[PDB]
Design a protein around this ligand. Structure first.
Ligand code: HEM
Ligand SMILES: COc1cccc(C(=O)O)c1
Ligand SMILES: [Cl-]
Length: 393
């Protein structure tokens, strides 16, 4: 009944160009079985959306990577939000939602915007830059660690730690095992910065620790909630902003539309998240026998959701392989969907909006002028190097 495929969605060949294999996964059927890793896969929008929105049947507390926490020990203590189910998920999720709230965005927006404008001005003085290291990495590094309340020393651990975390959702391939082999110094730094005395007053981390007296979380839960933000809050935005710049560099007609109406910046970033899907995949684990797309899946089975493929499913999207900054993007699953939908999405969208606004107002052209190099990760899609020439407006 269920088609069996030999595609490895975590192989370097797949990462290098995933779109043909993603169509093969979609067109084989609503539910496939991946013989390489003994998991079920869903690559169409409908089934990915359905799985995300049934957390009772497709749970997260047995891990959202390949490893099943009921069978193997997690490589680090489980996240209290990403790797939890309702009801244990509910109150930690509420705290992070209030920490990363609209009111918090109003407090930091002017600073985030000023830093975006300053970075673009700085880059325009150089002309020829690397849009990854000098922009997609440099800008989030210039705002997010400060907004967290982190000290200056040791920030070089943040991107390596996040790369490790996202590699660790993958299967035990060389990417994952090499990441874990090098993990010790990055885990040590991150776990230490999660303690209340090491988080500056007014930042996200101090606000988490201040929310430990309402009956929603206890003081011993705050370090792991800070860890969630230090795991998921930086590398994601790096690849999201990098995706947006890569899109504008490849689709100059859309850069010209953005320049003519800078208020399109927020949707231009949202469309980049759909188009590239920086977070490509997550797993769930079935808690019972379930019918999905006419197929019967037993209890305790891993289900791999192809978020990037769902975001390019022609059953759901018109011209899915086109970057369109005025597309109605509502419903894309690049931030997930349902009870686990990205709790930091307001931060991600704020960073992306103000950076694309700075580009819209200050830059006339973005031309690739060097070899493009891809960065390989079991969960994240993005570039290692994006040489571009920026022409001032
Ligand atoms: C372009 C940027 C980002 C993308 C594409 C992204 C993607 C996602 C996705 C797909 C999920 C759902 C995970 C699941 O269903 O299992 C998620 C959840 C989450 N994200 Fe984001 N994210 C981004 C930025 C951020 C930022 C800036 C933060 C923090 C400041 C953050 C923190 C989190 C956390 C803690 C969760 C877990 C939420 C929960 O389980 O309830 N992310 N993200
Ligand atoms: C996609 O959201 C993420 C990603 C990685 C880690 C976490 C966390 O809670 O530690 C969350
Ligand atoms: Cl850790």
């Amino acid at each position: 009944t269920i088609p069996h495929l030999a595609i490895d969605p975590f192989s370097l060949d797949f990462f290098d160009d995933p779109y043909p294999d993603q169509q093969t996964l979609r067109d084989a059927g609503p539910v496939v079985y991946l013989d390489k890793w003994n998991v079920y896969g869903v690559a169409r929008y409908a089934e990915v959306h359905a799985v995300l929105n049934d957390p009772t049947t497709f749970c997260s507390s047995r891990g959202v990577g390949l490893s099943d926490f009921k069978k193997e020990k997690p490589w680090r203590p489980p996240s209290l939000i990403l790797e939890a189910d309702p009801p244990a998920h509910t109150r930690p999720r509420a705290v992070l939602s209030k920490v990363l709230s609209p009111a918090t965005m109003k407090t930091i927006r002017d600073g985030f915007a000023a830093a975006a404008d300053a970075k673009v001005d700085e880059l325009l003085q150089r002309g020829c830059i690397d849009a990854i290291a000098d922009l997609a990495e440099a800008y989030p590094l210039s705002v997010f660690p400060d907004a967290m309340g982190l000290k200056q020393e040791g920030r070089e651990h943040l991107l390596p730690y996040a790369g490790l975390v996202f590699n660790a959702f993958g299967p035990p391939n060389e990417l994952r095992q090499t990441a874990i082999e090098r993990s010790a110094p990055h885990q040590a730094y991150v776990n230490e910065q999660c303690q209340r005395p090491n988080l500056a007053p007014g930042g996200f981390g101090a606000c988490i620790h201040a929310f430990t007296d309402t009956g929603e979380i206890t003081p011993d839960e705050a370090p792991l909630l800070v860890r969630s933000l230090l795991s998921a809050g930086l590398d994601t935005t790096v690849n999201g902003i990098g995706a947006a710049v890569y899109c504008l560099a490849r689709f100059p007609g859309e850069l010209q539309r953005l320049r003519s109406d800078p208020t399109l910046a927020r949707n231009a970033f949202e469309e980049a998240v759909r188009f590239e899907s920086p977070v490509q995949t997550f797993f769930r684990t079935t808690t019972r026998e379930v019918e999905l797309g006419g197929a019967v899946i037993g209890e305790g089975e891993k289900v791999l959701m192809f978020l990037g493929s769902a975001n390019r499913d022609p059953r759901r999207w018109s011209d899915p392989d086109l970057y369109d900054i005025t597309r109605k993007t509502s419903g894309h699953v690049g931030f997930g969907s349902g009870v686990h939908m990205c709790v930091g999405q307001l931060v991600a969208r704020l960073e992306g909006e103000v950076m694309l606004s700075a580009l819209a107002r200050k830059v006339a052209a973005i031309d690739i002028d060097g070899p493009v190099k891809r960065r390989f990760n079991n969960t994240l899609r993005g570039l290692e190097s994006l040489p571009v020439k920026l022409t001032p407006a």
